[PDB]
Design a binder for these strands. Structure first.
Ligand SMILES: O=c1ccn([C@H]2C[C@H](O)[C@@H](COP(=O)(O)NP(=O)(O)OP(=O)(O)O)O2)c(=O)[nH]1
Ligand SMILES: [Mg+2]
Length: 903
DNA sequence: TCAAGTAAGCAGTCCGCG
DNA sequence: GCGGACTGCTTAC
């Protein structure tokens, strides 16, 4: 096999690399790497190295990396550009792995761990590490074993050994219900004291040194706690054994309103799963506790236990350890589903960066572009300092608030990357400028043609057409990967609907799920076999199809995020290729494209309908248009359709055979108008939406920009067994909206779109009557909480104090002096409830840490004083009033009337 | 919330609006 | 009480 790196670091004048050799073995080496950098030189000087603008460069080879860094400094002193890759380890990787890396994940040691620390005086701060570590569970991917380190003797209590027998039993049997599939994979090690525990953990770490290190909050808690605890007990040299190169650094991470410390372990790649999740999941969660996320992702129940965690070890050490084990397994289960580790490895090895650099789109693209240019003996420019400047973005059309019965949407394929490719936007392809007219003039095709030589954007930029720029070339490669995975995702989605249909008529039999590849549309043979399967087998197949879809989603959406990130990086001052000319060339072209095609679609439909000056495009945002299809349906007459699926087929055919060819013609003309390099504006049908045939449903509505709902029957070729609500921006979609309120508002919307006004009125009446019975957590609002201190004046709200912050201050006064009460954490999220006048808390609201039950110290009083009236008005009625007013209907029945008497 | 971008909505404070 | 100037937070894209 070809070799591949595991980790790389620069330590002084040495590169330290861990790698897998040609025989599949892990090895480590220290290389006295001599870096090269470049300076411009005279033409009369024969060279093979040229900068991206074709200017000749001389290569300077340095005796060592320190000399190279010093030369860069002196070049700044002189006032001359120092060209080349200044991050020497990336240059090292480029030289050492000068080929497309094929990695073998089975050879990479991925460690997943979690620790427990009993603390009787509040949250145990990792920077102090003053309490014993009393449990560590460490899963190793190569061994496929959970290694459990259990402290039996501590100043906070001496306990008996954990029992694997009781751990396996059902909770109804008094057990901990540790999943049976991992019971045989646990290796349990009890310790008589903490020094022995930690010395053994370090010896173990030396034998099985993680390459990828993950877990939940490991970067902010577990890692620094272990490091600092060992440092406190044994000293610095021992703690540094956590690094394979015995090198660590305290890293200060700054944010707008403060900073925190982490520990960098040279030679390890830490990928904290909470951060992988936040980056790759495309969720915004009301809480990021492992229990909350596990429930959301896996539908597992939260780990139950009596009393506070600070007393759990002494009261129930059995459960304490079992829950530490389960915590590690939960992260493994989330990854089995989401596959974020796989994704990180793919991206990291593709770019040739430290794996943890996947968190930085700028570092990722810097490396991809550097490797691409290096292959042509080209030399990258030096990064420069730029002042931050705002610049313009996408166009969003103002919709007329209203119901919209039949709607068809269209959207451009990966817009910004396609614009980069079409126009040929790149640092080195800038050809010049042209005198710009008002955007309106280009949209209406009355401005004079920008250029008859170069490819243009309506921001005034021109680009070469003789050769692709490095940005277009490299963005295309990642786009093509994204396209492949999106294909698998959609097939799995379509396959899912096939199974859902079959689940309506399952066979009464005992059988097994079919062995199929869900990434490809089911063949006729498979479909025939599916109709003869039991419900048990069908549901298992559905689960597998959905997991396949999720894997496809992870792979496709995050590759799209990467290429969108390149477009955005052009507008970030820290990017080597930062250039507002290029950033704005993309966004401005996007604004034109959207409004150009709005005009073309309107013109086309006015022609087909024999109307004039009517607006068929009701809305658009960035790269999508929404088209009213009422008139199209009406030309046939709703009476001629057999069922809902019949008119859906009709619209699907109309979009593909009539509208899309017209759309293509429009964009081809725009391409010629801008003299672009390649036509890549590909816009096809996305959604088909409308009410169920014969119903009083309204189909859809808009309240304003970025706020709408549609009853969708077909989404990009996936025909749904049951209609699916597409709701964007509305309160149902916001993590700040109470859980039970999201549910209720969604049902109100469903009834509006599918059933009509009377159905909505019936549901509203019921919810209003019963909502006071809802669990307090399900009706609490949620908010991030920043700058708590700023608004704290003697424990009371200062001027302009935000409502959620006021709630936190109320909470803080209520638990004052209690060292065991949960503390609100600056920057994290809280639940918020309004309080009735005259309450003992002394203010109109209270807030506590999100994802948790409010402390028993005050719970009863909070429950007693909750202001249900205010809660309902703010979170439910106000938003519903917005939906219904926009849709021109009433959630409460109006005077009959027509009572007229009895009945 | 360390880590590519902009557009734009709603809640809430403060306070004018004769 | 509504709504502009402002902050804070959250979406869509
Ligand atoms: O996080 C984002 C999202 C979108 N955008 C821009 C770029 C993107 O091309 C455009 C449209 O975004 P979408 O992801 O909604 N769709 P896109 O057209 O990029 O891909 P596709 O439609 O093929 O899924 O908005 C960003 O810059 N950052
Ligand atoms: Mg698109």
């Amino acid at each position: 096999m070809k070799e591949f790196y595991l980790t790389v670091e620069q330590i002084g004048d040495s590169i330290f690399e861990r790698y897998i050799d040609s025989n599949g073995r892990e090895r480590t080496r220290e290389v006295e790497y001599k870096p090269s950098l470049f300076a411009h030189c005279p033409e009369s000087q024969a060279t093979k190295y040229f900068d991206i603008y074709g200017k000749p460069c001389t290569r300077k080879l340095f005796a060592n990396m320190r000399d190279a860094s010093q030369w860069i400094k002196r070049m700044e002193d002189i006032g001359l550009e120092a060209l080349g890759m200044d991050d020497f380890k990336l240059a090292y990787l480029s030289d050492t792995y000068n080929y497309e890396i094929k990695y073998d994940h089975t050879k990479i040691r991925v460690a997943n761990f979690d620790i427990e620390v009993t603390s009787p005086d509040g949250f145990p701060e990792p920077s102090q590490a003053k309490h014993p570590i009393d449990a560590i569970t460490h899963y190793d991917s190569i061994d496929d074993r959970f290694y459990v380190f259990d402290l039996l003797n501590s100043p906070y209590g001496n306990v008996e050994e954990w029992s694997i027998e009781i751990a396996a039993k059902l909770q109804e049997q008094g057990g901990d219900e540790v999943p049976s599939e991992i019971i045989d994979k646990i290796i349990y090690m009890p310790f008589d004291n903490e020094k022995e525990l930690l010395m053994e953990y370090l010896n173990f770490w030396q034998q099985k040194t993680p390459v990828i290190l993950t877990g939940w909050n490991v970067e902010s808690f577990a890692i620094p706690y272990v490091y600092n605890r060992i440092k406190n007990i044994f000293g610095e040299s021992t703690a540094k054994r956590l690094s394979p190169h015995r090198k660590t650094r305290v890293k200060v991470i700054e944010n707008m309103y403060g900073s925190r410390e982490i520990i960098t372990l040279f030679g390890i790649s830490v990928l904290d799963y909470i951060d992988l999740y936040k980056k790759f999941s495309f969720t915004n969660q009301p809480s990021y506790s492992l229990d909350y996320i596990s429930e959301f992702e896996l539908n597992v129940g939260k780990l139950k236990y009596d009393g506070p965690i600070s007393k759990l070890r002494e009261s129930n050490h059995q459960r304490y350890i079992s829950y530490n084990i389960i915590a590690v397994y939960r992260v493994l289960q989330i990854d089995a589903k989401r596959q974020f580790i796989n994704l990180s490895l793919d991206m990291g090895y593709y770019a040739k960066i430290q794996i943890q650099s996947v968190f930085s789109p700028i570092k990722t693209w810097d490396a991809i572009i550097f490797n691409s240019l290096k292959e042509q003996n080209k030399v990258i420019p030096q990064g420069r300092s730029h002042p931050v400047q705002p610049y313009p973005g996408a166009f969003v059309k103002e919709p007329i608030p209203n119901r919209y019965k039949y709607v068809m949407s269209f959207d451009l394929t990966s817009l910004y990357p396609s614009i980069i490719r079409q126009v040929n936007i790149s640092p080195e392809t800038i050809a010049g400028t042209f005198k710009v007219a008002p955007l309106h003039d280009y949209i209406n095709a009355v401005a004079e043609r920008p250029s008859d030589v170069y490819s243009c954007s309506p921001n005034g930029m021109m680009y070469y057409k003789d050769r692709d720029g490095v940005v277009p070339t490299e963005i295309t490669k990642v786009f093509n990967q994204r396209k492949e995975h999106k294909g698998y995702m959609l097939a799995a989605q379509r396959n899912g609907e096939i199974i859902k249909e079959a689940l309506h008529n399952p066979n009464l039999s005992v059988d097994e799920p079919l062995d199929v590849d869900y990434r490809f549309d089911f063949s006729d043979e498979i479909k025939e076999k599916i109709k003869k399967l039991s419900a048990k087998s069908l549901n298992e197949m559905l689960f597998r199809a959905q997991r396949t879809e999720v894997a496809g989603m992870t792979a496709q959406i995050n590759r799209k995020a990467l290429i969108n990130g390149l477009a955005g990086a052009l507008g970030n001052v820290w990017f080597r290729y930062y250039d507002l000319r290029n950033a704005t060339a993309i966004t401005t072209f996007g604004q034109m494209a959207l409004q150009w095609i709005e005009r073309k679609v309107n013109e086309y439909l006015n022609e087909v309908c024999g109307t004039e000056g009517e607006a068929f495009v009701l809305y658009g945002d960035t790269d999508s248009i929404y088209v009213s299809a009422d008139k199209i349906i009406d030309k046939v007459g709703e009476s001629k359709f057999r069922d809902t699926n019949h008119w859906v087929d009709f619209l699907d055919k109309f979009a593909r055979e009539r509208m899309e060819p017209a759309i293509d013609r429009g964009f081809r003309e725009m391409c010629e108008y801008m003299n672009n390099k390649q036509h890549l504006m590909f816009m096809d049908r996305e959604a088909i939406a409308g009410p169920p045939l014969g119903s009083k449903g309204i189909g859809g509505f808009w309240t304003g920009k970025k706020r709408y709902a549609l009853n969708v029957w077909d989404m990009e070729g996936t025909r749904y067994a049951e209609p699916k609500l597409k709701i964007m921006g509305l309160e149902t979609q916001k993590s700040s909206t109470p859980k039970a309120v999201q549910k209720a508002l969604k049902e109100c919307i469903r009834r509006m779109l599918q059933e009509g006004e009377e159905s909505l009125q019936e549901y509203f009446k019921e919810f209003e009557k019963e909502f006071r019975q809802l669990n307090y957590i399900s009706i609490a609002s949620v908010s991030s909480a920043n700058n708590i201190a700023k608004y704290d004046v003697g424990g009371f709200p200062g001027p302009k104090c935000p409502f959620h912050i006021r709630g936190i201050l109320t909470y803080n006064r209520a638990i004052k002096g209690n060292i065991d009460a949960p503390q609100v954490v600056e920057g994290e999220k809280v639940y918020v409830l309004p309080l009735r006048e005259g309450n003992p808390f002394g203010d109109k609201c209270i807030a506590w840490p999100s994802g948790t039950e409010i402390t028993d110290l005050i719970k009863d009083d909070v429950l007693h004083w909750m202001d249900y009236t205010v809660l309902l008005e703010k979170t439910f009625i106000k938003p519903l009033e917005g939906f219904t007013s926009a849709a021109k209907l009433d959630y409460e029945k109006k005077a009959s009337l027509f009572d007229m008497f009895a009945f």
